[PDB]
Design a protein around this ligand. Sequence first.
Ligand SMILES: Nc1nc2c(ncn2[C@@H]2O[C@H](COP(=O)(O)OP(=O)(O)O)[C@@H](O)[C@H]2O)c(=O)[nH]1
Ligand SMILES: [Mg+2]
Length: 177
Amino acid sequence: HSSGLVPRGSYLFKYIIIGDTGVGKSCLLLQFTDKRFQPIGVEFGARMVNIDGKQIKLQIWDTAGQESFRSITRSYYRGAAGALLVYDITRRETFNHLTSWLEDARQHSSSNMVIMLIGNKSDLESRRDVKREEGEAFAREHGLIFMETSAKTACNVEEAFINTAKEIYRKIQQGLF
Ligand SMILES: Nc1nc2c(ncn2[C@@H]2O[C@H](COP(=O)(O)OP(=O)(O)O)[C@@H](O)[C@H]2O)c(=O)[nH]1
Ligand SMILES: [Mg+2]
């Protein structure tokens, strides 16, 4: 995919969503863009958001399941303004792989990319395998924002995408982007 010219006065933020297979990356995308959950046929989902009164299009790229069998292509990472780095709170091994995903994002995306750490599947509290505090600590260590989300119930999904956008916008307005 290649996005077109951005209309004057508006913004376009390319997002990526990375993490182990099955953590809910695709469901997060669709919950945000479509407000639906159905346990993706497209390279990306798009949605208009409003940040500081401005029109900002978020174009959220999906890995197309490639991480289940091969490396993620460099083209996927390129030009991203935002990344959700996702693990599944019910599976510790997905939390163990965060450092490796983060290192790849930092190797292949712009240094200015805003990364939010996401512990997904918060609705499965009885199956929790990673404590909230562990996610919080990882985020602090790596200078990331952190939320727990449920793509299923939509808990914190809007906030994850919008708060990431607010931060990108803040960096732009500060010339730090
Ligand atoms: N209970 C629950 N299940 C989820 C959630 N997010 C995703 N799933 C389920 O997790 C599985 C993997 O989701 P998917 O979006 O394909 O993960 P991806 O491989 O990381 O893109 C599917 O069976 C989803 O229905 C969530 O927040 N809660
Ligand atoms: Mg997927």
